[model samples]
Target: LNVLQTMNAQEYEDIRAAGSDERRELTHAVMRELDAPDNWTMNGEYGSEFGGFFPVQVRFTPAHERFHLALCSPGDVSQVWVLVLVNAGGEPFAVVQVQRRFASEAVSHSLALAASLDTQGYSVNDIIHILMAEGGQ
Candidate 1:
């Protein structure tokens, strides 16, 4: 695992332009594509503390496959919080936190994907594949 990297501006825009409905659907599709367990929840919180916040949870029966990713847009605020967690031995082996703020209505936004890992490796392709697979695409 490595530090999570922010999706480039162009890539992020492309994803958003595809529409929010598709984006929401894609979020779940990605988890299923990863072969995550059927019990896992995508786009919603798991506990009371963050009840309303949409937290995506991916739980693998084998445990090692467990990972959770969350994103929330509070109120009318333009900034969104993104969280990624990979659990090992009942604990998070890797966690990434990002605060994304939109700079304009033109769909320009800024993201910082920080992680607890030694390094984070990621790409927009991974996101597309995950979401597409989850949607049965």
Candidate 2:
């Protein structure tokens, strides 16, 4: 908050919002990129068993509470990262902006390998829309 006054939590959320559209098409785009995967579209709520299948479609929590939703593959039933999407609206919707998350042992190690600074070349571009404008269906 000191380094850049405007770039605070409000700005973060606003910037994040600017990154995607209000509609759920962005999430659909991610599904399209995945070519469809088991449990891609998760079911249930934030504190329940997320079921159903990929291209399934369901719900999400608030941006403050839970900005992104990731559903594990039914095939793996684990953290293989099948479907990942960002929140478009506070309430449930058909899609989201899509994001990537991971677990790390050290904050330093984590910083060097996640989000915009992602050491891996592919972490940040998953939601960039394949064509000029694109789809799960």
Candidate 3:
């Protein structure tokens, strides 16, 4: 519910609107939008379960408050990423964008990492640090 709802969130829409019609360029634009703190703040409104799958479309909130878990994978067929929106307290939310390098294998490996780390009791902040240390290749 939250995942779908947030896909259409005004913030996401604005980013989409700001992006290019060109596919690859659009992805770059989306990343740039997410990279900008002025575009969206992590108010704990949504978070990540880091589901080990492409397009991790689900809502999970079995723990914590202020923010609920929600994530969706990139729609690109060639290049993909696991995008998790997460935050803590009133801290600025971090957009955890993990791209799956295809020099060898598949996507969402980072999502798997997040899931593993989450299960190991990693906080949203820590996960963001790991994934986002981070961006623009």
lDDT by residue (32-78, candidate 2, tens digit) is 33321222232232222344332223332222332334433211222
Alpha-carbon error at 110 in model 2, in Å?
12
lDDT of 3 by residue, 1-137 (tens): 23322343343434434543432343333333232112122211112233323322333333434343344443432134445545556464665554442111211344445455566787777766775653322
Pairs of colliding residues, candidate 2: 39-54, 40-54, 85-98, 86-98
- Candidate No. with top lDDT: 3
Q: In model 3, what is the error at residue 67, expressed in angstroms?
A: 6.2
Model 2 segments more than 4 A misplaced: 1-66, 76-81, 90-114, 117-137
Reference-based TM-score, model 1:
0.26
Taking the tens digit of each residue's C-alpha lDDT, what string does model 1 give over 44-101?
A: 3233344433322222222223344444422222234343343434353322334454
Return the clash pairs for model 1, or none.
Answer: 2-119, 2-120, 3-119, 3-120, 29-134, 29-135, 30-130, 44-55
**Collision count of model 2:** 4
> What TM-score would each prediction reach against the true structure?
0.26, 0.22, 0.34
Off by over 4 Å in 3: 1-82, 88-92, 98-107, 134-137
Worst 10 residues of 1 by lDDT: 103-112
What lDDT would candidate 2 get against the real structure? 0.29
TM-score top scorer: 3
Candidate 2 vs candidate 3: the lDDT winner is 3
The deviation in Å at residue 81 for candidate 2 is 5.3
**In model 3, where is the ten-residue run with the lowest total lDDT?**
36-45
